[PDB]
């Protein structure tokens, strides 16, 4: 996981928010393998 | 009425060459860009941070026929069956055509001022993680200029090698893939974008290759050859541009390059040779046989119009100031303007029909490390 972090692998994510008005919650349909 | 030579040591190429100061303007890795740290859930992550677009760059997935632009594999799909792009969501934020981005932001006045690449970048960079964010972490994007499509990237990773870290074996479908950044025909219309790319990248960043030109170093009144370069065989401009990109500033662990690296190259289109170097250029040499390229630059676009008037404009500009103080500019297309004590030499490879006055007192020179230094005789005056 130190290699993973070092090469640019990111955190487990699902929900996001756009900061450009109008704000809206966008969620990833299926969890990333 | 007197005429004399100025002792002021400047450089007429300053405003023109600013976009080629990759360390100042991009300020991060090129081949592999992972210049910004981000803390998410008390864990540290690396994200691309470059302020310039990287033209023609894509990610090659080893022993896979899936393009990196395909969404990442999700749940019921195997890692190796997907790409790097953002997966399907409740709102279709990625991939997004230009027409879709234009519809989405039709009421946003400020966003109507953005160019296609800046619009794709701003769109992708607007998405913050929900709930406890506190993070500066954003996803990078890839804008396809041919398909006019914006792709948000789920993965910020650009290179993965080493049998213990990845499996190139296509018969091992469950494990992690091997990948590397590269430039090739299939990626030529692509624009790799970190969250930090300048909206005014067209004025501040490289794009087009400079025809009838080679990068050089300004040495007291003339643009001189870079002494320490690495020569490589390159069949064409695309090859030279691929070589310089491969050798360019890398943030990949062996880790922040800050844009330092072998970012620039001179292509000899007659000899079929690529000369790569790691020192920022400060001027151009007008040579009909060369193309000046960078690791950020488009793999194919060429601007053949050398700025011929740069020297004459500056001489004439200064003369608009009886004491005449001529600037330390020893090259021009108006041979008489230089006021050379001997006959100026006619540069045959110069499309601008430049003349150079070689017979003048030089106050600077280039040393072993491509550093331009003031001569010892003059160090005290300056």
Numbering used by the authors:
A (entry chain B): 2037 to 2069
B (entry chain A): 43 to 296, 335 to 401, 414 to 474
List sentences quoted exactly from the publication behind this structure.
Two of these, Apical Membrane Antigen 1 (AMA1) and the Rhoptry Neck (RON) complex comprising RON2, RON4 and RON5, play a crucial role at the MJ.. The receptor-binding site on P. falciparum and T. gondii AMA1 (PfAMA1 and TgAMA1, respectively) comprises a region on Domain 1 of the ectoplasmic domain termed the hydrophobic groove and a region immediately adjacent that becomes exposed when the mobile Domain 2 (D2) loop (residues Ser347-His393) is displaced by the incoming ligand.
Crystals were obtained for complexes formed between PvAMA1 strain Sal-1 (comprising domains D1, D2 and D3), or PfAMA1 strain FVO (comprising domains D1 and D2), and the peptide PvRON2sp1 (39 residues: Met2034 to Leu2072; PvRON2 residue numbering from PlasmoDB entry PVX_117880). The peptide is boomerang-shaped with one wing formed by a disulphide-bridged β-hairpin loop comprising the central segment of the peptide between residues Cys2051 to Cys2063, while the other wing is formed by the flanking N- and C-terminal segments. The solvent-inaccessible surface at the PvAMA1-PvRON2sp1 buried at interface is 2893 Å2. The loop 148–151 also contacts the peptide ligand but shows no important structural differences with respect to that of the free PvAMA1.
